[model samples]
Target: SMGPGASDCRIIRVQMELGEDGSVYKSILVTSQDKAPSVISRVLKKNNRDSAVASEYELVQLLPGERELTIPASANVFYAMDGASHDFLLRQRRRSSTAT
Candidate 1:
């Protein structure tokens, strides 16, 4: 028999890439109903990042077998993640510019 608060909430480990050799890692509490955008904000706020930068970043789950799943901004965190691991990566969105 498990405790009462089994799947109510969880502490997820997230890593943000700073540069070629730099990374910011943190453990944040995520509720079962928390959305991707909500979790993203928490991660950024934990690292003292500006809220404006939130638009440029996205949350991605790293699975075993070298696979990656991009979590949608409106998706529930608990529903999007697999049973394997709760590891995730915060990466800046690559913007494409118009060619001249």
Candidate 2:
């Protein structure tokens, strides 16, 4: 939940599973002020490939809602256009990382 001053925001949900052998697995979902975006998903198996690791996965989605109008995903594209916007200021200058 947000207040009237809160305009753009995003949320991420994560789920974890544990196996008998003490192995752990995870699933993650990302949401935005509006709706979810398209992303690439994949799964990697144990040595069946070339690595010694058990598995690997990745999910990449485009920016959502008004955030796209602000932060965007590409650093160069964002700095090129709205470099002076308040959104960039909030992310790069203001906004405290810890509570006072």
Candidate 3:
């Protein structure tokens, strides 16, 4: 949810990773009020990655001119990336449904 925040309003840019080819995921400007997990879930749903079964997404940070790095759960989403030089990529992981 993007709304009014304190003097230092936080915004995070999340994109779905297509592949090594690169992807420009749609932008959803969020604030500090937005929870990372919930935000990721919402993004997953939009990308059709959310399944009835358990599912999770790896939040990867794409630094400018650098490679991707998996973000830690304990890190603050708002302060996780340096806006000047970093972006985000979310890769969904869903379990298989087939029996062994």
Q: Which stretches of candidate 3 lie over 4 Å from their true place?
A: 1-13, 17-24, 33-35, 48-55, 93-100
Give the backbone clash total of model 3.
0
Against the true structure, what is each candidate's TM-score? 0.77, 0.18, 0.57
lDDT of 3 at 29: 57
- State the weakest 10-residue window (summed lDDT) of model 3: 46-55
> Which candidate has the top score in lDDT?
1
Clashes of each: 0, 0, 0
Residue-by-residue lDDT tens digits, candidate 1, 3-74: 876667788788887665456658878887888878888888877776645557778887888888888877
Once fitted onto the true fold, the runs of candidate 2 whose alpha carbons sit more than 4 angstroms away are: 1-3, 19-55, 60-100
Instruction: Name the lDDT value of residue 51 in candidate 3.
Output: 34
Off by over 4 Å in 1: 5-7, 20-22, 95-100
Best by TM-score: 1
Question: What C-alpha lDDT does candidate 3 achieve relative to the native structure?
Answer: 0.58
Per-residue C-alpha lDDT of model 3 across residues 21-93, encoded as one tens digit per residue: 4564656555665445645765566565533321356566677777766655556566665555446778766
User: 67-93, model 2: which lDDT tens digit per residue?
Assistant: 434333322221233323222111112
